[PDB]
């Protein structure tokens, strides 16, 4: 039949993709095509409008299987071709080794990291639910797509699966259908050599449908039957367990050998042999494939175009609301949503950053619809939730419901993490946050990494950033984690000083579209500054308080930049003139002009850093640094501070030292370099 | 009775605790009391002798309840006092806020990071079974105890127990016995907002024992049966369900505001005069409660004072396992082990890191029994296990014994490093290592952080260290994460370029007690350096190519050394003298003497780094940088180094500017500072 040769077309785009490349994975390709092709025809998607907000999304979370989701994209004409298939895992081509949403069209999210893709799917499945309870009505189901998503043996034994499928299951996200490949295969062997726990018994401890395919190698109909019966259970996400053999047709089939490396050219001839291929042919697509799916194409391509027109209807029928779901599929924040932010003056009293925080979250989220978030059960420490919203829950559980706001992730980090991706990935402008402590974080270093790769503007909430936390102690207290984020490309890691820095960091948060922000934030109060702004604050880094003679210069975040300024009265004393320079987010200061960044880092002048944190990073702005690169204590804070010597007189005497140390040198700004 | 009075002690003592730090967590310590009164009356432990080999263990994953175990310990006559809890989170005590290993006598590990517990407890209990499957021989059971860990919700949501429990399924230890406060209350309110999964499905699930104590604010005689039951079930890990109230006694009892912040002062008194103590009194230890507690410590003695004379007995009639086990427990490895390590000269092929690593752990594992370790499925990509050595499995699967060397963690490493702590917990000289990719590293730093914290000598082989994996791409490639842990205080992290730099990051590995440390690995082939050899490189940094004359030092780790030497050659075409330092492993350089470091990094000259990742910490050694500071690629390895520059020219090149660029400039070393 025509879905056969699809089928076996499928199959052979992935391993002769593999062959040319002479590296990748062809055996979960092989054991999935058949679900793969039975998924897809249920699908509505245009691959002219990758974009479509009401499309049903797809997720590969076993990512190495990368090569069945191109020959999919390929065959369905997506913007990638045969050619791109011949030039897999080569350098600068659309087809890289593991899928990434930037380069490959089709693509939802970044996988490859195993146990990402299915939480992305959580997230994907969490922002429908929450957009379709915003924009539905009567007659205008806006939002009624699902999300599919395939995994493998190794996303069931990572650990952020399992909280992602726990929440899942409380969040009774019944437009969630993911696909376990149940080959008992991975690259140690059987599964009976360390994963011998019962799945199925597991998922429905969680509160998901279950549907089994005994001969996923073959019964397509029983695939399809699945799907709609996971249709059927709207209060529950579903687990189909697709019992394949790995490397399916291949004289390896069954194996550990066929995970992970090419096929040998007589088991590809074979292959080919035995479905009806030219053994001396690669990259074959037969045009009744190509017919059969442009038919279902030109379908999904009518179902979107009347979309459209109930869009436009609803915009009629709804102008207010119609009005705000354009905007949000434009990508455009609301005009002015910025005048919602707080600003504060030097005669304000002392707040500590994560009650800033919480202040500006309160004015913003009533004026962003697009704005939701959580935290990892730190709701009353980090500060995350607004006064009178609602929470994000299924209305049948009394506590809360879909068009809610605000999500209880639970002690769930790094799923948190991977759901955050998920919902930016779902689109319509969603700008989405989740709270933990800074130290915290680090449970989710997995996801925060895609996050950046990914570019998602998502938003880390990271409260009780340093020593300053206290009593908790050296195990709760970070010291390595700004410099970790700060390292990996492409993260906004904001540590402002005050109120009007808190809402620069806010404004460079939402208005993100490429780069994550993680916000570093206190539990001690801080003082409001002496000439911080939101516009100064917004490059990144500026000058705080200008000395047109200084001596020494001191470049500082956070906390830290009041300490600098207690230092600047010492040194006085001392016959020597500070200036202060607060550097809130190092990645936003790199971005702006030499001549800007000169202007606040100028030759001639040492300047020293001040950050209770790792030196690591920090001599790109400075020729001395004070830090803490020890682990922290149990106490009072103020003491763990006096302690390390973080005192007004601690970081004069280290000025000083600094400016005798430069003494007879000639100093040119650390933003100079050879090359 | 004694033990009703025992039982309100503990209570009172822990909520007399947190009442004079006025922080700390009052709730759990009060829920948890009868369950710690009944555990510890059935634990063999010495509180004169924490290290006993065949001590019970006790692990507190729900560390903040910390004021518990301080009770317990004090009660028993550890050496930790009252005196010490009226000093909890006090700056310098014994007593701080999350239990630490270093510093508390007879806590285990350290925990506070909510997950690692338990998973240590897992650990632990894999050790003794190894221990005892190597030693005990009939009439001599040298290791027979048990490990008893308390957990509660939050534990139970992080991932990273997961993992831990479905290996420990698997691995069907029968010796773990833990404990689920089931409390239903977590920071966020209760567990119905984010928590409502089958959690005793679950564990059935993953093949554990379960015991339910429906009744666990009072029933201690039910605790008590419950820990009877779980010993008779040799083949699972029990989890027994303590259903309690949080806070039991408060007037907040069953409320959130219990979990995490000290009781009001007339709440404390209505304790005290309900439970028969005087409510004017603080820290009370009624005397029949030090007796009926001595009274256990005594009998415990008795039975280590027998288990002296088994273990002499046992050297007489097995005299090498004997002496073996003694060396053991003198913390002490074989004499001249490090014989055993591959030497190499620069006529020998060259050779990857990865394959490097396997040789060296094939050499080693025969002459060091106390090497255990694994990989999290990774085993013919890591190369972590040695030929003809057997798995670490129940005899009943077939798949290796309890004796066995060799450990399949599955797609696990968060658990794998949590494990790996409780290996090295249970003491007995385990020096224990696992595998996976370094980029994944970083789904374990949670517990990677905490190896550092807790001084655990634990090993992660972490291959695949850069671009130069190749096709895999950029989901797979580290950028950050070699900073990271080296801004860790407290890790090791070895980059070594060749076959004597490999042998050398072993021998530290291995002859560690106190420090973690990390292996990053390649995937393709490096040449045999000249001027390597394992003497030098255990220096962790050492001149390779000295030059009298040098007008630059390039300073390189791992696979960038090659590529150092290969640009001198480029720079003498130009008239440019260079000289090469490699940097294996920052922490052991920086721990030399300053007059050993100065030799090798000099005043007087320029020095380039050259390190295909993250430029971050590298100014502590260089002048300028070049590195890698954006995301890899997916193409052939050798084009990606191309594509970036890190080729003989494009070393030199930046050499030469770094030349040019400190003309007419006085240079001293990186490692000189003001302060
Ligand atoms: C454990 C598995 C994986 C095991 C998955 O077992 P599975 O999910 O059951 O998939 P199959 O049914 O196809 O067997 S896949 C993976 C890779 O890194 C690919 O993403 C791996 O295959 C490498 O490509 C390969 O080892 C390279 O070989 P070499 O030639 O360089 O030696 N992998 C590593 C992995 C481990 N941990 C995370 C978080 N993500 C990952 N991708
Ligand atoms: C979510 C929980 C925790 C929630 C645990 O719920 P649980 O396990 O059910 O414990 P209970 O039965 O006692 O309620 S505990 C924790 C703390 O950090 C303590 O370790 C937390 O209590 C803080 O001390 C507190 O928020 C500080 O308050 P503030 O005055 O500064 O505002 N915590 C945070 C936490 C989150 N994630 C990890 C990995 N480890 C952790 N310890
Ligand atoms: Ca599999
Ligand atoms: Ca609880």
Redesign the interface.
């Known amino acids: 039949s025509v879905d056969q040769k699809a089928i076996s077309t499928i199959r052979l785009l992935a391993v002769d993709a593999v062959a040319a490349?002479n590296?990748?994975h062809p055996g979960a390709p092989l054991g999935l095509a058949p679900a793969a092709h039975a998924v897809f025809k249920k699908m509505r998607f245009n691959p002219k409008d990758t974009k479509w907000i009401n499309r049903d999304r797809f997720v590969l979370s076993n990512?190495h299987a990368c090569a069945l989701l191109y020959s999919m994209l390929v065959l369905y004409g997506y913007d990638l071709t045969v050619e791109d298939l011949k030039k897999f895992?080569?350098?600068?081509?659309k087809t890289?080794?593991?899928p990434?949403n930037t380069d490959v069209p089709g693509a939802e999210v970044?996988?490859?990291?195993?146990?990402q893709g299915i939480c992305n799917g959580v997230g994907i499945a969490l922002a429908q639910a929450q957009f379709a309870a915003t924009y539905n009505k009567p007659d205008f189901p806006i939002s009624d797509s699902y999300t599919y998503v395939f995994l493998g043996?190794?996303?069931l034994?990572?650990?952020?699966?399992?909280?992602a499928s726990?929440?899942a299951?409380?969040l009774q996200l019944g437009n969630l259908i993911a696909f376990w490949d149940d080959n008992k295969i991975?690259?140690?062997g059987s599964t009976?050599?360390?994963?011998?726990?019962?799945?199925i018994?597991?998922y429905?401890?969680?509160?998901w449908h279950i549907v089994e395919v005994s001969d996923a190698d073959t019964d397509i109909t029983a695939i399809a039957a699945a799907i709609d019966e996971a249709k059927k259970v709207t209060n529950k996400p579903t687990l189909v367990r697709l019992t394949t053999t790995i490397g399916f047709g291949s004289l390896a089939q069954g194996t550990?050998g066929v995970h992970g490396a090419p096929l040998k050219a007589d088991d590809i001839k074979q292959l080919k042999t035995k479905w009806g291929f030219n053994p001396e042919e690669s990259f074959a697509v037969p045009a009744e494939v190509t017919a059969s799916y442009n038919e279902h194409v030109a379908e999904n391509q009518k179902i979107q175009q009347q979309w459209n027109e109930l869009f436009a209807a609803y915009k009629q029928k709804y102008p207010e609301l119609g009005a705000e779901l354009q905007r949000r599929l434009d990508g455009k924040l609301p005009e002015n949503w910025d005048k919602a932010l707080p600003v504060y003056t030097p005669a304000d009293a002392a707040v500590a950053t994560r009650k800033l925080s919480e202040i500006v979250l309160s004015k913003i989220i009533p004026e962003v619809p697009e704005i939701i978030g959580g935290?990892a059960?730190?709701?009353?420490?980090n500060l995350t939730k607004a006064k009178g919203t609602v929470?994000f829950?299924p209305a049948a559980?009394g506590?809360g419901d879909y068009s809610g706001r605000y999500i209880?992730?639970?002690?769930?980090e790094?799923?948190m993490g991977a759901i955050m991706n998920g919902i930016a990935a779902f689109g319509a402008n969603y700008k989405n946050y989740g709270g933990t402590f800074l130290?915290?974080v680090?449970?989710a270093?997995?996801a925060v990494?895609?996050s950046?790769?990914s570019e998602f503007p998502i938003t880390w909430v990271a409260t009780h950033d340093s020593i300053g936390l206290?009593?908790?102690?050296?195990?709760?207290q970070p010291?390595?984690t700004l410099?970790?984020?700060?390292?990996?490309?492409?993260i906004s890691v904001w540590r402002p000083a005050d109120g009007n820095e808190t809402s620069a960091a806010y404004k460079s948060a939402i208005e993100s579209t490429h780069t994550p922000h993680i916000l570093a934030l206190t539990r001690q109060n801080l003082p409001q500054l002496e000439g911080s702004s939101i516009e100064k604050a917004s490059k990144g880094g500026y000058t705080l308080v200008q000395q047109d003679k200084a001596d020494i210069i001191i470049v500082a975040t956070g906390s830290e930049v009041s300490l600098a300024v207690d230092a600047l009265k010492v040194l006085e004393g001392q016959g020597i003139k500070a200036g202060v320079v607060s550097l809130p987010d190092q990645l936003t200061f790199d971005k702006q002009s030499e001549e800007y960044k000169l202007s606040v880092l100028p030759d001639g002048v040492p300047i020293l850093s001040v950050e209770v944190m790792?030196t690591?990073?920090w001599?790109k702005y400075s020729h001395?640094q004070?830090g803490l690169?020890?682990?922290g204590?149990?106490?009072?804070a103020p003491?763990?501070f006096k302690?390390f010597e973080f005192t007004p007189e601690g970081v004069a005497?280290?000025a000083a030292?600094?400016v005798?140390?430069?003494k007879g040198?000639?100093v040119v700004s650390p933003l100079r370099?050879?090359?």
């Open positions: 490349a590296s990748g990512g895992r080569q350098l600068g081509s890289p080794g593991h990434e970044t996988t490859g990291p195993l146990g043996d190794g996303c034994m990572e650990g952020v699966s399992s909280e726990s929440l299951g409380h991975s690259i140690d009976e050599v360390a994963f011998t726990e019962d799945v018994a597991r429905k401890s969680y509160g550990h935290s059960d730190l709701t009353p420490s929470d829950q559980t506590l209880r992730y639970g002690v769930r790094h799923a130290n915290f680090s449970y270093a997995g990494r895609l950046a790769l206290g009593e908790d102690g050296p195990t709760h010291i390595e410099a970790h984020f700060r390292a990996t490309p492409n790792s690591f990073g001599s001395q004070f690169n020890r682990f204590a149990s106490g009072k003491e763990i302690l005497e280290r030292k600094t005798a140390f430069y040198k000639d370099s050879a090359f």
